[PDB]
Design a binder for this molecule. Structure first.
Ligand SMILES: Nc1ncnc2[nH]cnc12
Lengths: 233, 225
């Protein structure tokens, strides 16, 4: 029914949604579609649709589209982990993405700026309203929540040279592989989106080792915070 | 019972009018997710035609929308691609037997390039549509070339990057949207056929010519479906 509010909650990997399903604690019906498993439950009278997309831009575009078109979700909250590009963002710290960019798009051979695609824009915006809510919830929990630009692309970044490019070209604070495609799809449909990330690594030569040591704790941190936001919705 | 619903995607806007005009039936414009879908009925099949837009996110969105919102059961995707190999020339028509996202890189974890966990490097296409393409080609006096198409969100033109696509994936041609549309179709169980006219071994003139011959090719595949 259109009288039932529907909220999509997305992560990229199983580990990013496991804690979400546990924290919400209601029974979820499993519904397979398009290679994804959607978990549908009712929490405080809201239908919550939870899924992990699998990694990267094509997987996350597909899953966000299914949530909106097939499940009729009217907000998307994305939760997961990211690599830090700035010294003040340390392991486990939370960032909300005020703008996102696809950092790997390169049509500069035809004089477009890096990150730009025709009919689109370098920077994609998220919901003022939901980010304002994230800030209120962080303040009300005594959690430090940074706001910044997140760069997304289909490579796991693990080099000083790529980090330096991300900071100089886009002034990005963190890097990951899905945010910009989820925020893009939500913008095309006019659906409010929030992208929350907790830092798992520093996107440098050691990033794989950090990512594996910290993924689960960082995914839990983001997942708890997302649950705090749904509790105020 | 249910009508057959066929989706036709063009990778360039210039390809779209030639398609609608050749089908010769009335098309209704339906906007959705910033895309425009043209819906008509040709020989009692529903035909939904759209430009994919540029880059993998745009084309994943267009394809997922066509499947979920219009119920397309098979997808034909036409466009242009640059050659990576010695035996292709301008205006050759190539059917993609497999595709790859050539820019995917999780090598920090010792995964091979192009690979994502819970996925695979190569994306397959429809044996029965690719066979139909070969039949149509016969009838239209076209030699259909077969190969691997590599797709990524960068324009590929350097010697080093072209030789990488050949050595890493044995790709025959390169473009930006094919892999993502074939991948979405695979996820949903939708037969897909990806056809590309080879652009380089005057662009606007090549584009205008290839759009007409591809329109003609697509319509005669539909005639056999
Ligand atoms: N360094 C990194 N690069 C891309 N995506 C990530 N997610 C977490 N860390 C990342």
């Amino acid at each position: 029914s259109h009288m039932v509010q529907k909220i999509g909650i997305l992560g990229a990997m199983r580990e990013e949604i496991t804690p979400i399903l546990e924290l919400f604690g209601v029974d979820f019906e499993e519904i397979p579609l398009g290679g994804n498993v959607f978990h549908k439950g009712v929490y405080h009278n809201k239908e919550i649709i939870v899924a992990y997309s699998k990694i990267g831009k094509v997987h996350s575009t597909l899953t966000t589209t299914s949530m909106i078109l097939a499940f009729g979700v009217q907000k998307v909250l994305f939760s997961g982990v990211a690599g830090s590009l700035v010294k003040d963002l340390k392991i486990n710290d939370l960032l909300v993405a005020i703008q996102l960019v696809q950092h790997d798009v390169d049509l500069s051979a035809f004089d477009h700026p890096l990150g730009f695609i025709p009919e689109s824009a370098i920077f994609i915006e998220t919901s003022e309203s939901l980010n304002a809510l994230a800030k209120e919830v962080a303040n009300e929990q005594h959690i430090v929540l940074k706001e910044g630009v997140i760069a997304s692309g289909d490579q796991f970044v693990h080099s000083k040279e790529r980090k330096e490019f991300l900071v100089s070209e886009f002034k990005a604070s963190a890097v990951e592989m899905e945010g910009a495609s989820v925020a893009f799809v939500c913008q095309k449909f006019g659906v409010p989106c929030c992208v929350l990330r907790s830092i798992s690594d520093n996107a440098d030569e050691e990033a794989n080792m950090s990512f594996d040591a910290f993924l689960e704790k960082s995914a839990q941190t983001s997942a708890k915070f997302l649950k705090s936001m749904v509790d105020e919705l």
